[PDB]
């Protein structure tokens, strides 16, 4: 039961749009902040 968007025409259309008309990435995903190892992992 794969959603309509992630298959056939709907996806190729979405990829084509994303390729030729990409968004500002810095505004979409923000600044990559340093990985806090004490916060993320055990020990």
């Amino acid at each position: 039961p794969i959603p309509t968007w992630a298959r056939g025409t709907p996806l190729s259309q979405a990829i084509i749009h994303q390729y030729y008309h990409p968004p500002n990435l810095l505004e979409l995903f923000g600044t990559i902040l340093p990985l806090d190892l004490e916060d993320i992992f055990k020990k």
Binding site: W5, L11, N24, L25, E27, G30, L35, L37, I40
Partner: protein, 275 residues
């Protein structure tokens, strides 16, 4: 979006499994709000702890937060759960290069020379900025919407390559004599691999491969390269100048870009950005 943009799994709609990595699976997903398609890689925290790659992963994030290149697959950002670490990665619509090669049997001079320049460039960038990168070979390379080569990452999950492993994996070809023997190796190894990669893409199989392991071993150390007479002369030349026993006389990156054959057949074009 002011200056917060902290993401969770609740911010994504999940589409389909794209494949299984060593540490965890990669799912095609899109942001709910913007509908921007990404490749979501789900790491098991317990697996990166087991392998002692806490620092390596930190370094991957630090590199990808400072460096960008159109022929190195992008990390947009990451989040983490109690159990999981999520990497939001650039989606490669045309998948794995090795898979495209088997389907194509061989790549024409155009697609091959376009990759070789793209890679030579990405690697010049990587050595200028003094950073490690994922060793180059068809398995480790992904493809953009117009077949732009993407180095999968800056090689944090890369394991110290074993002679025995490479023999069994059938990846002995991408190991130069220095590595094969006890001897010290630098980023001049990169030059050899591009030579191997170029031969593989054009012919369909790695130059040194055989039926015997001792044979493949002998052919590498004697650099016994054998070109099919159907091989374009320009290409034979480039591979002859890259696949040399002596590391210090291997055609440098600056001159792979300038090599006549590349010039004549490369159709490299940057993918669209915003600003």
């Amino acid at each position: 979006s002011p200056a917060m943009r902290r993401l969770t799994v609740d911010d994504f709609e999940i589409g389909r499994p794209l494949g299984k990595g060593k540490f965890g699976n990669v799912y095609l997903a899109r942001l709910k709000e913007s509908h921007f398609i990404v490749a979501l890689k789900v790491l098991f925290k317990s697996q990166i702890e087991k392998e002692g790659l806490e620092h390596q992963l930190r370094r991957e994030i630090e590199i990808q937060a400072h460096l960008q290149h159109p022929n190195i697959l992008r990390l947009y950002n990451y989040f983490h759960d109690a159990r999981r670490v999520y990497l939001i990665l650039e989606y490669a619509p045309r998948g794995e290069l090795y898979k495209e090669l088997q389907k194509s049997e061989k790549l024409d001079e155009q697609r091959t020379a376009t990759i070789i320049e793209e890679l030579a460039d990405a690697l010049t960038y990587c050595h200028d900025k003094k950073v490690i990168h994922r060793d180059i070979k068809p398995e480790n390379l992904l493809l953009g919407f117009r077949g732009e080569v993407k180095i999968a990452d800056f090689g944090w999950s890369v394991h110290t390559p074993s002679l025995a492993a490479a023999t069994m994996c059938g990846t002995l070809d991408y190991l130069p004599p220095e590595m094969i023997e006890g001897r010290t190796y630098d980023e001049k190894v990169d030059l050899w691999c591009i030579g191997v990669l170029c031969y593989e893409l054009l012919v369909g199989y790695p130059p040194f491969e055989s039926a015997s392991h001792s044979e493949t071993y002998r052919r590498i150390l004697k650099v016994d390269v054998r070109f099919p007479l159907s091989m374009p002369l320009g290409a034979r030349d480039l591979i002859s100048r890259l696949l040399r026993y002596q590391p210090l006389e291997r055609l440098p990156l600056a001159q792979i870009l300038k090599h006549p054959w590349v010039q004549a057949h490369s159709r490299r074009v940057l993918p669209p950005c915003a600003q």
